[PDB]
Amino acid sequence: DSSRASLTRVHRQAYARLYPVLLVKQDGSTIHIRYREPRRMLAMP
């Protein structure tokens, strides 16, 4: 049950647009992250 609280949102009022950018840290594990300016792919050198 790894999706029950994945469909949740920010409950504040002051914020900008957030987008589902896929991120990889070091090994090739893409994860959706609420990140501005959609990159759709991130990798840390």
């Binding site: 029950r4 609280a5 994945s6 949102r9 994860i31």
Partner: protein
Amino acid sequence: YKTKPTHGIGKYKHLIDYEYGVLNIHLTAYDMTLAESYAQYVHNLCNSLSIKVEESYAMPTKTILTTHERVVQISGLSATFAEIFLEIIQSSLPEGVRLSVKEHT
């Protein structure tokens, strides 16, 4: 009155085995949204299962993008109860979240 059978009818102040210690669950996540949602879900599970929860604060953000941090305080576990609690936590981790079972200090 003292001598009457109804003495102390109105008193109220008196109304106000191995176990774990203070447990800190640290949730550092890429998403403020996901961290807050996981905190809400775990708090709901704790208060449904009757777990003494003390604090749900957050650490200051660190920049090096940013990762948002949350804390959940827990006290009072049983042998089977702790097992169920953390196995449920493990099985119900939504996406790329960093748990912890660290303690105070």
